[PDB]
Design an enzyme around this catalytic site. Structure first.
Site, PDB file in Angstrom:
ATOM      1  N   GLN A  73      -0.942 -27.008 -19.080  1.00  0.00           N
ATOM      2  CA  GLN A  73      -2.066 -27.165 -18.732  1.00  0.00           C
ATOM      3  C   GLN A  73      -2.311 -26.148 -17.396  1.00  0.00           C
ATOM      4  O   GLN A  73      -1.536 -26.356 -16.269  1.00  0.00           O
ATOM      5  CB  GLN A  73      -2.895 -28.244 -18.611  1.00  0.00           C
ATOM      6  CG  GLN A  73      -4.403 -28.226 -18.677  1.00  0.00           C
ATOM      7  CD  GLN A  73      -5.122 -29.508 -19.056  1.00  0.00           C
ATOM      8  OE1 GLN A  73      -4.581 -30.571 -19.887  1.00  0.00           O
ATOM      9  NE2 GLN A  73      -6.168 -29.738 -18.554  1.00  0.00           N
ATOM     10  N   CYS A  79      -7.404 -30.586 -21.773  1.00  0.00           N
ATOM     11  CA  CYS A  79      -6.355 -31.163 -22.251  1.00  0.00           C
ATOM     12  C   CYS A  79      -6.459 -31.418 -23.784  1.00  0.00           C
ATOM     13  O   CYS A  79      -5.553 -31.777 -24.407  1.00  0.00           O
ATOM     14  CB  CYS A  79      -6.343 -32.648 -21.679  1.00  0.00           C
ATOM     15  SG  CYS A  79      -8.118 -33.313 -21.705  1.00  0.00           S
ATOM     16  N   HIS A 236      -8.172 -38.424 -20.763  1.00  0.00           N
ATOM     17  CA  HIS A 236      -7.331 -37.202 -20.897  1.00  0.00           C
ATOM     18  C   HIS A 236      -6.680 -37.371 -22.375  1.00  0.00           C
ATOM     19  O   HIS A 236      -6.093 -38.306 -22.830  1.00  0.00           O
ATOM     20  CB  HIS A 236      -6.511 -37.324 -19.794  1.00  0.00           C
ATOM     21  CG  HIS A 236      -5.312 -36.278 -19.659  1.00  0.00           C
ATOM     22  ND1 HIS A 236      -5.682 -35.331 -19.029  1.00  0.00           N
ATOM     23  CD2 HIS A 236      -4.157 -36.151 -19.746  1.00  0.00           C
ATOM     24  CE1 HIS A 236      -4.508 -34.336 -18.808  1.00  0.00           C
ATOM     25  NE2 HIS A 236      -3.584 -35.097 -19.392  1.00  0.00           N
ATOM     26  N   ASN A 260       1.847 -35.734 -22.453  1.00  0.00           N
ATOM     27  CA  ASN A 260       0.762 -35.361 -21.404  1.00  0.00           C
ATOM     28  C   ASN A 260       0.950 -33.785 -21.849  1.00  0.00           C
ATOM     29  O   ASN A 260       1.923 -32.998 -21.270  1.00  0.00           O
ATOM     30  CB  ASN A 260       1.093 -35.627 -19.996  1.00  0.00           C
ATOM     31  CG  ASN A 260      -0.091 -35.188 -19.084  1.00  0.00           C
ATOM     32  OD1 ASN A 260      -1.032 -34.494 -19.450  1.00  0.00           O
ATOM     33  ND2 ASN A 260      -0.126 -35.955 -18.002  1.00  0.00           N
ATOM     34  N   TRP A 262      -0.591 -31.648 -19.629  1.00  0.00           N
ATOM     35  CA  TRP A 262      -0.314 -31.089 -18.428  1.00  0.00           C
ATOM     36  C   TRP A 262       1.309 -30.675 -18.378  1.00  0.00           C
ATOM     37  O   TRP A 262       1.565 -29.831 -17.301  1.00  0.00           O
ATOM     38  CB  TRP A 262      -0.109 -32.070 -17.171  1.00  0.00           C
ATOM     39  CG  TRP A 262      -1.588 -32.282 -16.848  1.00  0.00           C
ATOM     40  CD1 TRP A 262      -2.829 -31.742 -17.067  1.00  0.00           C
ATOM     41  CD2 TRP A 262      -2.051 -33.444 -15.929  1.00  0.00           C
ATOM     42  NE1 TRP A 262      -3.779 -32.234 -16.443  1.00  0.00           N
ATOM     43  CE2 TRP A 262      -3.602 -33.370 -15.892  1.00  0.00           C
ATOM     44  CE3 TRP A 262      -1.409 -34.330 -15.349  1.00  0.00           C
ATOM     45  CZ2 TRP A 262      -4.036 -34.051 -15.034  1.00  0.00           C
ATOM     46  CZ3 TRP A 262      -2.023 -35.273 -14.346  1.00  0.00           C
ATOM     47  CH2 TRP A 262      -3.357 -35.104 -14.327  1.00  0.00           C
TER      48      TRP A 262
END
Ligand SMILES: [Ca+2]
Ligand SMILES: [Ca+2]
Ligand SMILES: [Ca+2]
Ligand SMILES: [Ca+2]
Ligand SMILES: [Ca+2]
Lengths: 319, 319
Positions: A73, A79, A236, A260, A262
């Site tokens: 990300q 997300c 998230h 995740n 990210w």
């Protein structure tokens, strides 16, 4: 898979025109300019739109496979989209449907790429130019862990074009992207009132290639993106990427693997990357679960702890 | 220069206490945490706070002098403050009053710096620790063009501290920052309706060590940061960094020099970097004016056109 470009022209036609004329494709419907970034205000920084060749010496569309390790990300609250993409990468064939074959920066390259999304009852061809938002010679939004790889960045651009801007990708639902990649309908499970056989439901969903996500409920808008002491993020979208088991203290322990979007920042309790639990799991068993210590956003959890810590799980089946 | 810390202790006292214990200074009053970054909220991405040593191997406070080339804006709409800092760099005595003299990462380094701001009737001494916001191993906000240089990033942190947060700095008054750096009295001139003696006023003011800024008027707030076809940014504070006459095709054209605090993105028309006007100019007059072609932020324009395209010019005089 229907043409949607205002010219009425097809991805191959427009590509072929550019190759013959010897120019790069410039997209008339989603221009490389400030209105395609944000609608609510101009950005405070000097964005420069750049083709991947202007960013690195040797650009590549897909490099080492289109994988979840390629979903990191950027500075955008999408997300939910990227968790859907990471989930989509676990099914090579559901992925080939969103990402048409034989796109590259090698022979045939004319600055043009295309992706297929499901919208509203149908499969759209969405065509883009490869000019990407940059600042300080770097991608600001979605990037692969390998900075020579652009398929994830381009897919996000195509999806931003789908929604009229990059800003429209800020805040959403994984289900929205999941449905757009599959043309299925998403089911929501609720973590603490799930069936007795919930684990089996997820295992079997993952196995037949369904997109799985999950998330922690945010009690208020104030709580959005809050890091819990356990290293988890509230409000998230996470990708569910694995369902499996190990023997621990001589009992079978149901594990779930979560990612995740990210590409970093992970769970820090039982079965996390550096937790004691792993020291008593042998190398064969550990190689099978692909356990490694890496801040890559991907971690294992005990299914019991997952159910306790997370609040929602989405399943979206392919068809 | 008044102490401002809740501990009541001086910069020197906290510094000696830190290296007495062999530790690095953490600022109680402005913690390395979200409260110090935003107030409606969080970043959509994991900023990690890193001392300069954790960012770069050989960090240094000042390199090549503390110059305006060290003011490249990060992801924050604080052009007004940066334009002021850059303006301040052209008067070295004034700049020494804001930046205390013997600060470095050499012997006596303890993760603690301080700056000095004029607040209404007194200079304040504002101490920070050097934990700075970074994402993906790079500073997010203000940074020098040299990645091993941290004075300007630090100044901006300390100025963020003064205002409560980094978000506090989004939008602001150039006169406000100029007066905070000097203690002088401000002076606004309307470019289109200025005295028939204006060019000398600016030349005298610039030579005198005064700070000068200029900007274009914002009609809408939705016009803020919009670009002109001439490559200027509306609602955007520039530093005026040079005033000079040159002869060219028989006449003498009054030239003015301006700098974008982005450190990048410049004027398009006559006397711009890669404009043809320059060819008609001797190499001895070229290297006095420091004409080079590079995306500096900084550029010359013909005074007529400056009046034509800018709306307001703000001078902060010490005398
Ligand atoms: Ca890859
Ligand atoms: Ca991991
Ligand atoms: Ca310098
Ligand atoms: Ca614009
Ligand atoms: Ca320049």
């Amino acid at each position: 898979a229907r043409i949607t470009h205002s010219s009425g022209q097809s991805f191959e036609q427009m590509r072929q025109e550019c190759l013959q004329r010897g120019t790069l494709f410039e997209d008339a419907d989603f221009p490389a300019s400030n209105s395609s970034l944000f609608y609510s205000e101009r950005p405070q920084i000097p964005f420069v739109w750049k083709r991947p060749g202007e960013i690195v010496k040797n650009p590549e569309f897909i490099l080492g496979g289109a994988t979840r390790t390629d979903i990191c990300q950027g500075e955008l609250g999408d997300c939910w989209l990227l968790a859907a993409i990471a989930s989509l990468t676990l099914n090579q064939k559901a992925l080939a449907r969103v990402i048409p074959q034989d796109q590259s920066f090698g022979p045939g390259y004319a600055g043009i790429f295309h992706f297929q999304f499901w919208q509203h009852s149908e499969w759209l061809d969405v065509v883009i130019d490869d000019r990407l938002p940059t600042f300080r010679d770097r991608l600001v939004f979605l990037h692969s862990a390998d900075h020579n790889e652009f398929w994830s960045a381009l897919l996000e651009k195509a999806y931003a074009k789908l929604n009229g801007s990059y800003e429209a990708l800020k805040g959403g639902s994984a289900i929205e992207a999941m449905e757009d990649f599959t043309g299925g309908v998403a089911e929501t499970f609720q973590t603490k009132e799930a069936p007795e056989n919930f684990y089996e439901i997820l295992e079997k969903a993952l196995k037949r290639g369904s997109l799985l996500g999950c998330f922690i409920d945010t009690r208020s808008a104030a709580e959005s993106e809050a890091r819990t002491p356990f290293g988890l993020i509230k409000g998230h979208a996470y990708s569910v990427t694995g369902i499996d088991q190990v023997s621990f203290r001589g009992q079978r322990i149901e594990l779930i693997r979560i990612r995740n979007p990210w590409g970093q920042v992970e769970w820090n309790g039982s079965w996390s990357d550096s937790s004691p639990e792993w020291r008593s799991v042998g190398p064969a068993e550990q190689k099978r679960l692909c356990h490694t210590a890496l801040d890559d956003g991907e971690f294992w959890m005990a299914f019991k702890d997952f159910k306790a810590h997370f609040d929602k799980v989405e399943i979206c089946n392919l068809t």
